[PDB]
Amino acid sequence: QVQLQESLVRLSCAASSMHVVGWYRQELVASITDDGSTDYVDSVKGRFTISRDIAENTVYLQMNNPEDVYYCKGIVVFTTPMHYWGKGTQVTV
Amino acid sequence: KPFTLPILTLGELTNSRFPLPIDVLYTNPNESAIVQCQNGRCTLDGELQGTTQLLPTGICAFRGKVTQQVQDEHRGTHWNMTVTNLNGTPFDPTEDVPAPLGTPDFSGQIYGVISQRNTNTVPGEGNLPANRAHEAVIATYSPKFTPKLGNIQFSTWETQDVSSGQPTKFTPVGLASVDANSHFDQWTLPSYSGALTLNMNLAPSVAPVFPGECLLFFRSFIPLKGGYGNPAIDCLMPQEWVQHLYQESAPSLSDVALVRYVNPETGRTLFEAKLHRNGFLTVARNSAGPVVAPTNGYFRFDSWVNQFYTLAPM
Amino acid sequence: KPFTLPILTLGELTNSRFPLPIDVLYTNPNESAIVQCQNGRCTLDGELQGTTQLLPTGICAFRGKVTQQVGTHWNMTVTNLNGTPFDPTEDVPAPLGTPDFSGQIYGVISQRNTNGNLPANRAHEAVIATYSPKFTPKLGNIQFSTWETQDVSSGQPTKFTPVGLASVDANSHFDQWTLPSYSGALTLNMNLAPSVAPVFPGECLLFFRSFIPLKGGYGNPAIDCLMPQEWVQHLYQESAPSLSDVALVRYVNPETGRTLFEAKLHRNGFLTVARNSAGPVVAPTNGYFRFDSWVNQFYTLAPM
């Protein structure tokens, strides 16, 4: 119902306020919640950094290897989530 | 006029407490809860009780109008809805019913779709009314669930596209969750007027009266929006029995009707049960769980008996 | 065994072609389309026709398993509603309950996995375009689309609960009297319940009309059935011998005791009235049809 939008060696996500926003790849990469809490897959730990920016209306994924398409995913009602996916952006190193 | 049941296999029956097909016959003799559901309640001589109505489309349905967006202490976007009778007439809270007919009769997060069709046309948008529909959840255990007072609340994932003051329909689909915090309990009634008020005009509780018997249920499995679980909803009689009993209105000639579950191919009785005047089944059984019976079987009325009749064990 | 109809007002009837209450009786004599719906078809002596089955929950429902991803589109094998595999050589147009009109049908796809010993679940809004070349229920396969992009599981029990239409705009091909091609472009429809029409001048079909919800956009779409689902169920139960061509029925007001109009209920299971205008039958909410007597087709109805 919302329309998420992302962005080969700053990706922005934009919608048509969400409870979690996360970046994926093809597996989970990095996520941030509206508590400001973050989490990372073990293979990305230390090199990757998720960060929320309310002022600029987007969620960035700063990535600091050849084993690295990336997607934006965004709402909870009671304790039941619904997820909203963007269409993606390729990443190749 | 002689009492009859319809001739319908389990595969031709639907649940009277949620819009689902019947999946299996079921017993649970170790049930500690008082069984007092309000949908699927009909006496054998055709008196609907509780919140029971005839439409399969009315079970756990609501009709009304959204008044405004509201706040509540849980995640989501929240909306207040006045509710009418399902036939569109204003609900009169002083009527002798527990709640508008069709109101859900159990505690849980009921998941479905809210849809609206506007009454008006807007200048510049054309001569046909606008529409919208979104997934929604109604927590029947919430203090804001007050259908007997003529209004309820629902929550959506959608944050803006629900219109105030427009005709609104809730189509039930399943449950949102059966996790700890979601309070699914099929035998716990909602407080239809909210937390501060007693329920009224209830269909009575049901139980076997002869020792060694237990209730027999028609069980359906109910969909989940997400999470883990295999939730089920047990009704006392399928909706087609409610409809048939209402049509026939046959006088009940004793307190208990002996019925036999028969295999039409062999003509043989698979097991027997008591069909009580208030509208529920008991059997003599020493296993709990789903009933193993051939798919072509159905209940046939045999004769009127008394409360002391001894059933053959299943 | 005497022929009977149940005693049910419009407010106690449901549509046999979509899970909706009946809202109004309706005529439309100038309909150019062939009326040949496949749900809500039952003879007066209780023989189901077309894709008609008895469950209100089965109307426009599907049961099956998702095979793969193909908006986002998913391919789904469909079974009979009782879970048994559908045999395409069976003498039916499609699995019983299959939608019988062209449109974008909107509803919810839900899944409960086969494997604390409790299965995972998911449900999403979904749309089934019955006019698509991939709508092939007679071949045991259909496609549905979701707004949801990823969380639909392959090889898991899947249920479609119908709710309304996605749209009735031009590109949505809603036409309640256009049948789906149940086998797609590959073969013509088979074993169909026959088309219905008045045979004598001055008569037209009488419909039980329901308004169907919309996911979005503009419109007030309706779905018209020939007999409500409760009549299908009743006829199936009773199986009363049909004694002539037509059951003459009278629509009566129980409060005044007066007959409002009469109709022919044809053996194949549809109504005609003597009317030559389109629109609602304006009738008291307490009215219902009562069987009067068997007549032949040459009976002349009083104008309603």
Numbering used by the authors:
A (entry chain C): 1 to 7, 11 to 12, 19 to 25, 30 to 39, 46 to 83, 86 to 89, 92 to 97, 99 to 117
B (entry chain A): 225 to 538
C (entry chain B): 225 to 294, 300 to 344, 350 to 538
Quote the paper.
The human norovirus genome contains three open reading frames (ORFs), where ORF1 encodes non-structural proteins, ORF2 encodes the capsid protein (VP1), and ORF3 encodes the minor capsid protein (VP2). The X-ray crystal structure of norovirus native-size VLPs showed that the VP1 can be divided into shell (S) and protruding (P) domains that are connected via a flexible hinge. The S domain forms the scaffold of the capsid, while the surface exposed P domains contain the main determinants of antigenicity and host binding epitopes. We determined the binding sites of six novel human norovirus specific Nanobodies (Nano-4, Nano-14, Nano-26, Nano-27, Nano-32, and Nano-42) using X-ray crystallography.
Nano-14 bound on the top of the P domain in the grove located between the two P domain monomers. A vast network of hydrogen bonds was formed between Nano-14 and both P domain monomers. The majority of interactions were built between one P domain monomer (chain A) and CDR3 of the Nano-14. Six P domain residues (chain A: Arg299, Trp381, Lys449, Asp403, and Glu333; chain B: Gln384) formed eleven direct hydrogen bonds with Nano-14. Five P domain residues (His298, Val361, Ala363, Arg299, and Trp381) were involved in eight hydrophobic interactions with Nano-14. The nine P domain residues involved in Nano-14 binding were predominantly variable. This finding corresponded nicely with the ELISA data that showed Nano-14 was GII.10 specific. Remarkably, the Nano-14 binding site, which is largely formed by CDR3 loop, extended between two HBGA binding pockets. Such strategic positioning of Nano-14 resulted in steric interference with the two conventional HBGA binding sites and the two newly identified HBGA binding pockets. Moreover, three P domain residues (Trp381, Glu382 and Lys449) were directly involved in binding HBGAs and Nano-14, indicating a direct competition for the HBGA pocket.
